[PDB]
A paper describes a structure:
HIV fusion is facilitated by the viral envelope glycoprotein (Env), a trimer of non-covalently linked heterodimers (gp120 and gp41) (Harrison, 2015; Lee et al., 2016). Binding of the receptor CD4 to gp120 triggers a series of conformational changes, including opening of the trimer, exposure of the co-receptor binding sites, and rearrangements of the gp41 helices (Blumenthal et al., 2012; Harrison, 2015; Ozorowski et al., 2017). Here, we identified a pocket in gp41 of our previous cryo-EM reconstruction of an early pre-fusion intermediate Env (CD4 bound and co-receptor mimic antibody bound) (Ozorowski et al., 2017) that is proximal to the FP and contains a bound detergent molecule used during cryo-EM grid preparation.
The C3-symmetric map suggests dynamic movement of the FP centered on F522 that is not simply a difference in rotamers, so we generated an asymmetric reconstruction of the same dataset (∼4.0-Å resolution) to investigate further. In all three protomers, the phenyl group of F522 appears centered between the side chains of L537 and F518, resulting in hydrophobic and π-π stacking interactions, and the cluster of 5 aromatics is preserved. The extra density near F522 in at least one protomer appears to be from hydrophobic interactions between P43 (of gp120) and the α, β, and γ carbon atoms of F522, whereas in the other two protomers, P43 interacts with either the side chains of L523 or A526. Portions of the FP in all three protomers appear to form an α-helix. Further assays measured an average half maximal inhibitory concentration (IC50) of 1.6 μM for GO52 against B41, although the small molecule was not able to neutralize other viruses in the 12-member global panel.
Numbering used by the authors:
A (entry chain B): 512 to 660
B (entry chain J), H (entry chain C), I (entry chain I): 1 to 96
C (entry chain E): 33 to 124, 197 to 306, 325 to 352, 361 to 392, 412 to 458, 467 to 504
D (entry chain A): 33 to 125, 197 to 306, 325 to 354, 361 to 392, 412 to 458, 467 to 504
E (entry chain G): 512 to 659
F (entry chain F): 517 to 660
G (entry chain D): 33 to 125, 197 to 305, 325 to 357, 361 to 392, 412 to 457, 468 to 504
């Protein structure tokens, strides 16, 4: 809902769809929005006209903007913080750290077609710190190797 | 064409329409492009012509997409053709 | 060679439709209809307009295909039904409703239209624009200039001037069924008075308007000189068509303009209670005249003419009269993503 | 090529806590306690509620482990301490006793809603078969709650929401015979409580009476019992502090204690008394309030629920204000979203 | 003129010249800014000092912020939505889809030096959806082979 | 808030600042640490309306300006081939005459406040060279 | 190895100027000059100061080459021109003379502070030792300065800030005998200035100020102890003369213009001999102006001496009001951040 | 279990505790799970058994984490065990 | 340097200037660096010397960049040099 974000709200609908479906959904929306097919709509609150509405439409006016501004800072922040694993400036980023069956012994189509992110990120929650560490290490080694060529 | 026959001294009505039913501005003109009637929004004008007098329109129907030309006490000289000016629908109607 | 290259920030604007905000100098304490209405409808105007002239960008404008006109019209319908309420309102079988009639003052104030969340408004600054076609001097604003919501027919009062020359503009100047708008480059003062001594009845509904003969004739002369490059009694119809109909002080006036179209020449004016409505087809009754003296003073800024197929000053209706101010504005949006071939290839 | 792939836009919820803020339609000109409090404590109401349904996401709720309850607790005790000031306040220490001046004030609870700070949202369960905990199959997101009146209630729950179609029996452990069972009714029972302006006698000035419609009362219990019998294939309170034993409440600033014996065993009348000595619900301690108002006081309240207990065949329970708030806050939880996630993908870097 | 971020300002300027000139001018201003030679003027409405400006500078204050915040969001969305054609995070993206003469049988110098973006995007507007489709297809095929 | 999270490193060495940014970003990516902001609350009461609206709006204007500069620079840097990056390594060699110092001396015994004074008079020169290299690199690839 | 690398987010500031704005606790209802000016000129004060210490940063704060001083100057001139209006104002041309009515207003300076516009910040020195314009080792960043009352007193610096621990003596050149030496005290000394109700004779233009002997003597002994640091072999006298605003210790209090004879201070209850005058040499620029005759009633100031101005050829002196403001607005500078920097690194592009 | 021996015809205080040093919900129940005594937030209630009467607690110590059961005028028939329900610390005591 | 010969009893009018035409702090001092005359913003001050008296200036010309030292009743004993302190334009003049 409003107050939660900007980026995430666009990506929050169909939260119960599978992750495969979510990817396809994002792809079609970009086709529709890059193209001239889908028009944009705004969700902005109106400024007051009269003194009687000054508190009501100023407090919420400011709060809506604060939420959206912070959402932008988080989007942009995270987009560069992620450069540690090499994946800066990306939504989807493929790396060379292999998946172990010790993390999840499932196939790719089982994970992408019969599961939502809501379940997936709970099933492997205890491997999060481990995997993230490996991603950092892999990026460091890649940088080392390229600089040596 | 929408063609009707009248007799000297009677009252007849010719009609123009709009499918949108939005009271689209209209005009009525004869074969020599002489203004007879027309509207200006909700108001009824008369053209500065021989048909200025004895002319009317059922204005309550303009909001229903019907823009009639009513000519009272017809003379034989009044039995001309008329052109509808509604939207781009330059339709011809005729009085015999 | 000649490969597709995608560019972002492409400065291409296209006409678009959005809902506009109104803005005005409302006071909210003086009981007057426009200031009170505006208090709960419009915001104060942009304190710092940008007026950005876009170089020599040429833009195709068309005042008769515009939609800013409807935005103004819808707001006006709300303004009038919410203020100068008729005692009796009859309209489509038909039905009638009635209302209490407290009297209120009525003095139109300029109202500006503003475009939110993008949607810049382009303005034509050309003096030779003439209603439609490419405009060679285009600027961009967030808010338009203010337009007073005057509902006069025939002669239009308190609008803007053409500044240098009288402009004759119409959708089809050779047809003449449609109203030709004559925008004056000069204003002519009109002083309308109903003295408090006219107390008799069977008078209380009579008034006269003072026009300077010299100013009027100078104005007609310039209009004709311009018309010649391509003035009689009005043709007839409802009184709002036939006479110079206007509302001032809340009173509804119907003035005889024969003296203008045929010093201290006067129009013969009547104040009426039975008014044909412009909000749709219907009629309405308003309460009888205010006891006391009423004096109105206005600037004649334009003339509405028609001709047959030498002119009849019988034009004007609501939503057409406002095109005389909104002719220079359009709303556009930007589509920053575009493509051009260039001298490169990927990798 | 079943390699780790990093993704953004992963809509994965985590329960989180935050300093939620309150909002209400406060006025600041009517001198009443809630509107001279909420005007500095709470902001104007949400101008545009969204109710976004999150597809068919199933989410686990637990109304007894919620944190929105603590937020409601702290704000209400601040409201009370800052308004309905006792003349004598007694706090355990030995003891610590202080005194205050006692202007009387009007007291009429208004709905107050809690709103998420930026970066947070509140999920709510729209299930008609809520149960009390476990998976909810209809989840929507809002910034703010619907507005809950800070009504003390104590024995029977007054001026809350209804279950609409069925009476919902909610308990952390329905068979432990220890926890209070919260009953949410599908119909409100109207109660009309009056102290007429003829009660001017002294030993009278502390007497009042409440009228309950018999048809509504008996139909309500019949429906409750019908459900209790499904869970388990008719008495009054056992005793204790007077706030538990009787249906105590604050209305008009006065503290009423109504005897519900006639209800638990038309125009059923309860004997009520107005007291100056009240055991506090805010914590352990006691307080004295100014003597009764001369004039006629009438309260009209909606019973929207009950606090019942069952032993190791049921009784009224009461007090424990956290439960009264749970009765309305059960639908809501605060979450944050962690948009960065990972999954195996059939790909290689380059 | 509506506060459409700081992004669409230099492009109001660009609207008045040729496509080539627009790229040039943007490059020039950009280096002057990177170098600390020139600075941009901040245009932020003053919040009111006095009570008489309430409902004026407070409404226009919020309105400018909404227009600017929204413009930033729209900008960022396009920058990432362009990932479909492999053009994310860019102002200029050169692709491997060739230009057809059937879209426009013109010389590159004629296109960039004798035309403005305003004309260019109108003359070929009827091929926009077509080209966009081709770009997606090409990006998919490139990923398909890059991943072998 | 881009500058705020970086400016707090003033007074530490250049190397220390780079390490600090790496660590904090890592903690954030992993969900290890939590943040609170410094936003001013909108007013509860009408009586606090000027006080919490004037500063409310000014704070938002400052944040919007900060993002506009951030994004502007992230793309203006395309000229040197540094767009989209915080750190951009190029193929223009350091001319020793600009400093005559060792990399470790610069990164470990100096802060940015000192370093950017030491080479201030070569700023325009270096920037020019960076543009030139990017132009040549683009040509080299397009020529194939 | 040793390739050029570009870094964005570099924590480097450089001095900059800007149209810095004021904020104050303005009231708009008390008729007083500052509170009927600041209500249109200044915003409410900063509700959430940050005071961020920049690590181990050492930086130069040259109070005599600052720009914040000019902004303060222009705003004070507007304040005065718009309030304490003379009946006759004379500007050099030949002359150009205009007249005004002399309504009287009260005059009680309130603290006013300056705040940074978006993109800017103010650095401040928090050290105890500054060496005048030199570097200090305690630097923090703020959005707004400490409030300064815009007092235009002349020989003594009235109602300013304190040095807290020691008397701090500052000059661009402590030995050129051209600069005014600013002395900031670590303690305030009260000066009880009164124009009593019995002055009805013509006396109506007489006044007196009472200063503690113990306080004056201790303060001056402490000043000497610090003067000895620069002048260890030397050893406070009557001023040399000039415009009366310099010769006597003048100030504006209650709207009256006082001219006090400080001979007893620079040689309990030391009594200064004060007069109230109507013909005044303007401090605002070169020119002269006439004010209305004295107020019939009783006016008292009870001001704080927080500093003084000395000249050496160590006599009292003053004038050039911008230099008094330098003291009060001492230790602040406006800077902006330049996010790009370049350094050599051990890497290469492709 | 913790066993407390009295003089039988006397008043006995048995206790349940919490390390939180906070007043929290608690209950005392007998061997047939019949409620004896417990709280309702700040309030003290009794259980509907033979120990409903002749019983007390120490409300003032609930925030010290001490939740006693006081049985007055104790009878031999009352020498049963009791289960504590404080947090999840389901301790058992016996009264003799 | 600029040297001016006067007669006993006359008025000297030595000047220091600034091309800026701004409000400038300036001072006049003799050869022993003893202050004679100078300003404090708009105000005129005198130096603690034999020239404390018999001295004036032109306040009205200060914002025109003209800062005179006017010695009255000139004596031959006043035939010293004087140093200007205007901005950094430390010019010297002498009387005879
Ligand atoms: C073009 O623009 C011009 C402005 O440049 C417009 O001109 C203004 O027109 C209004 C028309 O009403 C006129 O307003 C009156 O001014 C009077 C000033 O003395 C007022 O006294 C008068 O108020 C009375 O009449 C109102 C009804 O109209 C009542 O509502 C009000 O309560 C007052 O009525 C009481 O007092 C009278 C007098 O004793 C008594 O008779 C009543 O019974 C009652 O007791 C109006 O406010 C403006 O003064 C004109 N402005 C100028 C500069 O001339 C012009 O109208 C615009 N043209 C068009 C077409 O809109
Ligand atoms: C559940 O919700 C319902 C609403 O849906 C709540 O019902 C409302 O309860 C309040 C309780 O006070 C009641 O308010 C009173 O209405 C009276 C109308 O006549 C007022 O007269 C009365 O004001 C007097 O008492 C106040 C103190 O109680 C004083 O502060 C005030 O100044 C007035 O007192 C003076 O005047 C009287 C009369 O002359 C005199 O006796 C006094 O001595 C003194 O001089 C209150 O405003 C509402 O009317 C009820 N609303 C409805 C629709 O019935 C209900 O309380 C909620 N339930 C719970 C448990 O919270
Ligand atoms: C340093 O800081 C201190 C604060 O710590 C400043 O001290 C304050 O100074 C003001 C100004 O003098 C003083 O305000 C007056 O207090 C009086 C209390 O009796 C009021 O009576 C007086 O109001 C009258 O005078 C005003 C004009 O000065 C009028 O505008 C006003 O309407 C009042 O007029 C009536 O009374 C007078 C006097 O009898 C009579 O002549 C009139 O005809 C009429 O009848 C002011 O409010 C504060 O009280 C002082 N504060 C303290 C604690 O003492 C000090 O001034 C600062 N120093 C400098 C140099 O700025
Ligand atoms: C403030 C703000 C900033 C950015 C955004 C935003 C919107 C849409 C996307 N789109 C996306 O992630 N997609 C997935 C990858 C793909 C398929 C092949 O390319 C395109 C679609 C990203 C960010 C929203 C708000
Ligand atoms: C509006 C706004 C926009 C962006 C930001 C922002 C915050 C933090 C970073 N982080 C960073 O610069 N780092 C350096 C490079 C590294 C070390 C190895 O990779 C990771 C960490 C960037 C932008 C804040 C606000
Ligand atoms: C919120 C926000 C604010 C500002 C901007 C902004 C960013 C970049 C430009 N610059 C540009 O379009 N250029 C043309 C291409 C080139 C030459 C080689 O790269 C660089 C210069 C303008 C505005 C975007 C978002
Ligand atoms: C319903 O309530 C009972 C209470 O004892 C609990 O055990 C059960 O887990 C709850 N939820 C569901 C879905 O059964």
């Amino acid at each position: 809902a409003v107050g939660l974000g900007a980026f995430i709200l666009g990506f929050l609908g169909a939260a119960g769809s599978t992750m495969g479906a979510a990817s396809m959904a994002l792809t079609v929306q970009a086709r529709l929005l890059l193209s001239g097919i889908v028009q944009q709509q705004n969700n902005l609150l109106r400024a007051p006209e009269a003194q009687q509405h000054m508190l009501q439409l100023t407090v919420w006016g400011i709060k809506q903007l604060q939420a959206r501004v912070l959402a932008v800072e988080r989007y942009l922040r995270d987009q560069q913080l992620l450069g540690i694993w090499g994946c800066s400036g990306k939504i989807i980023c493929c790396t060379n750290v292999p998946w172990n069956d010790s993390w999840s012994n499932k196939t790719i189509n089982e994970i992408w077609d019969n599961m939502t992110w809501m379940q997936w990120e709970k099933e492997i929650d205890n491997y999060t710190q481990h995997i993230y560490t490996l991603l950092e290490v892999s990026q460091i080694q890649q940088e080392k190797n390229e600089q040596e060529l | 064409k929408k063609v009707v026959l009248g007799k000297k001294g009677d009252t007849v009505e010719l009609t123009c329409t709009a499918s949108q039913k939005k009271s689209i501005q209209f005009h009525w003109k004869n074969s020599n492009q002489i203004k007879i009637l027309g509207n200006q929004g909700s108001f009824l004008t008369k053209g500065p012509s021989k048909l200025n007098d004895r002319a009317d329109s059922r204005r309550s129907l303009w909001d229903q997409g019907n823009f009639p030309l009513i000519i009272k006490n017809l003379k034989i000289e009044d039995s001309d053709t008329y052109i509808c000016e509604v939207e781009d629908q330059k339709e011809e109607v005729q009085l015999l | 060679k000649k490969w597709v290259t995608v560019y972002y920030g492409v400065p291409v604007w296209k006409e678009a439709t959005t809902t506009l905000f109104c803005a005005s100098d409302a006071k909210a304490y003086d009981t007057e209809v426009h200031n009170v209405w505006a208090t709960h409808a419009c915001v104060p105007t942009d304190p710092n307009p940008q007026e950005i002239v876009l170089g020599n960008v040429t833009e195709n404008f068309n005042m008769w295909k515009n939609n800013m006109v409807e935005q103004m019209h819808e707001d006006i319908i709300s303004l009038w039904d919410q203020s100068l309420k008729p005692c009796v309102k009859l309209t489509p079988n038909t039905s009638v409703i009635t209302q209490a009639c407290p009297k209120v003052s009525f003095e139109p104030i300029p109202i500006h239209y503003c475009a939110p969340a993008g949607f810049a408004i382009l303005k034509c600054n050309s003096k030779t624009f003439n209603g439609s076609g490419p405009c060679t001097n285009v600027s961009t604003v967030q808010c338009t200039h203010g337009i007073r919501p005057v509902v006069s027919t025939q002669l239009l009062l308190n609008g803007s001037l053409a500044e240098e020359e009288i402009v004759i503009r119409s959708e089809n100047i050779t047809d003449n069924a449609k109203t030709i708008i004559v925008q004056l480059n000069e204003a002519v003062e009109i002083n309308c008075t109903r003295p408090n001594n006219n107390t008799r009845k069977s008078n209380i509904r009579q008034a006269h308007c003072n026009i300077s003969k010299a100013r009027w004739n100078e104005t007609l002369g310039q209009i004709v000189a311009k018309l010649e490059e391509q003035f009689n009694h009005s043709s007839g119809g409802d009184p709002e068509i036939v006479t110079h109909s206007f509302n001032c002080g809340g009173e509804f006036f119907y003035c005889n303009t024969t003296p203008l179209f045929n010093q201290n020449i006067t129009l013969q004016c009547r104040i009426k209670q039975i008014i044909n409505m412009w909000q749709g087809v219907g009629k309405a009754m308003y309460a009888p005249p205010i006891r006391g003296q009423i004096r109105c003073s206005s600037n004649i800024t334009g003339l509405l003419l028609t001709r047959d197929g030498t002119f009849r000053p019988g034009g004007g209706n609501m939503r057409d009269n406002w095109r005389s101010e909104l002719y220079k504005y359009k709303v556009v949006k930007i589509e920053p993503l575009g493509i051009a071939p260039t001298a490169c290839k990927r990798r």
